[PDB]
Design a protein around this ligand. Structure first.
Ligand SMILES: Nc1nc2c(ncn2[C@H]2C[C@H](O)[C@@H](COP(=O)(O)OP(=O)(O)OP(=O)(O)O)O2)c(=O)[nH]1
Ligand SMILES: [Ca+2]
Ligand SMILES: [Mg+2]
Ligand SMILES: [Mg+2]
Length: 341
DNA sequence: GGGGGAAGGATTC
DNA sequence: TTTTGAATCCTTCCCCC
């Protein structure tokens, strides 16, 4: 099986450039302003010019500004980015029937049945990069290999505006040399539990006792890593159906005073429902992020779809179940809906 | 012993 | 004054046959 992965380059920042070309060349930083105070919030993403100087996703807007005080700072426009993405995705649907839309800027194409070797694949990759750059003037990076995991790793090494293939021989090379932390699905917390069992490479996972690994990272991660080490990872490019829609917002100030919180929670529901658009959820979860940034959540499932009026009522019941079973103040309150009919 | 759903956990977009 | 926000798939817990 041959996999072709497409990962839009610095997408949010790039889509902004596409709507205001004058931005090209200058460092652009797309922000998520929180509103607690002047320039509060974090950076959603920055084009490469900005990244060169330490301005990247996650860093507070404040700091980003100390580094590049004269950069173009723009407020995130998800809706807009979403629509461009949809279009770009529909372009990809013309290179394969089997397409997996991982995120707003990532899709996997099963091009086994469309090409035969990595040369023919690699060409289709360029044909794809072009079609997109033509129809939407957006640069992307393509990853090609035997499975989704290594396809993605290709793209990771190539971006931006790149394209790379990882043949069966190199997959084996990487199984030995690639830093296990640079494997899709292995975040910091898990990297540590590993880049700690002497497991700093994929291959290493085959030499340790299974149970030891399982006990540390979990049965699922353990099997995931093992299978990759053995070169038997072949997940199918399946269609992902969104399974939950929600919205969580930052309050002007921390609190555990029910009335004071109600407005924010209702705004979250309002927006949540607008986003649900026709989808009917039989499950609701009130999510709270405390002052010390921990996550607390209570939810209920109904044998029927939830009406917005119901959402409102039950949410308050859940927010109360939170306030009662926790004594920490709350900083962020939101809601999340699932189990669509 | 294990199916199955609630709450926290972590990853990553 | 971090610190943002959305959605997932994983583990862990208790209920129940
Ligand atoms: N709201 C929000 N969006 C983020 C954040 N980090 C990344 N994103 C969004 C922007 C991108 O479209 C998508 C990014 O994907 P990745 O983290 O793989 O980085 P990549 O370099 O592919 O994306 P980029 O376009 O560079 O931001 O997720 C964040 O902290 N907050
Ligand atoms: Ca990207
Ligand atoms: Mg991405
Ligand atoms: Mg990692």
């Amino acid at each position: 099986m041959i996999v072709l992965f497409v990962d839009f380059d610095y997408f949010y920042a790039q889509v902004e450039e596409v709507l205001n070309p004058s931005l090209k060349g200058k460092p652009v930083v797309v922000c998520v302003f929180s509103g607690r105070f002047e320039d509060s919030g974090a950076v959603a993403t920055a084009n490469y010019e900005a990244r060169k100087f330490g301005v990247k996703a996650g860093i507070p807007i404040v700091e980003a500004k100390k580094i590049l005080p004269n950069a173009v700072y723009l407020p995130m426009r998800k809706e807009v980015y979403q629509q461009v993405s949809s279009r770009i995705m529909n372009l990809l649907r013309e290179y394969s029937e089997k397409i997996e839309i991982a995120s707003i800027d990532e899709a996997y194409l099963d091009i086994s049945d469309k090409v035969r070797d990595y040369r023919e694949a690699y060409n289709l990759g360029l044909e794809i990069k072009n079609k997109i750059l033509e129809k939407e003037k957006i640069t992307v990076t393509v990853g090609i290999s035997k499975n989704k995991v290594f396809a993605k790793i290709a793209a990771d090494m190539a971006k931006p505006n790149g394209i790379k293939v990882i043949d069966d021989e190199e997959v084996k090379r990487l199984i030995r040399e690639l830093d296990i932390a640079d494997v899709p699905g292995i975040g910091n917390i898990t990297a540590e539990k590993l880049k700690k069992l002497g497991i700093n490479k994929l291959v290493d996972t085959l030499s340790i006792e299974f149970d030891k690994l399982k006990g540390m990272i979990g049965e699922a991660k353990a099997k995931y890593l093992i299978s990759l080490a053995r070169d038997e990872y072949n997940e199918p490019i399946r269609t992902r159906v969104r399974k939950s829609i929600g919205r969580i917002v930052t309050m002007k100030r921390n609190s555990r005073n029910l009335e004071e919180i109600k407005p924010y929670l209702f705004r979250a529901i309002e927006e949540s429902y607008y986003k649900l658009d026709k989808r009917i959820p039989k499950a609701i979860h009130v999510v709270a992020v405390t002052e010390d940034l921990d996550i607390v959540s209570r939810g209920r499932t109904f044998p029927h779809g939830i009406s917005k009026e119901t959402a409102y009522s039950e949410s308050v019941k859940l927010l109360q179940k939170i306030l009662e079973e926790d004594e920490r103040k709350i900083r962020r309150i939101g809601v999340r809906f699932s189990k669509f009919i």
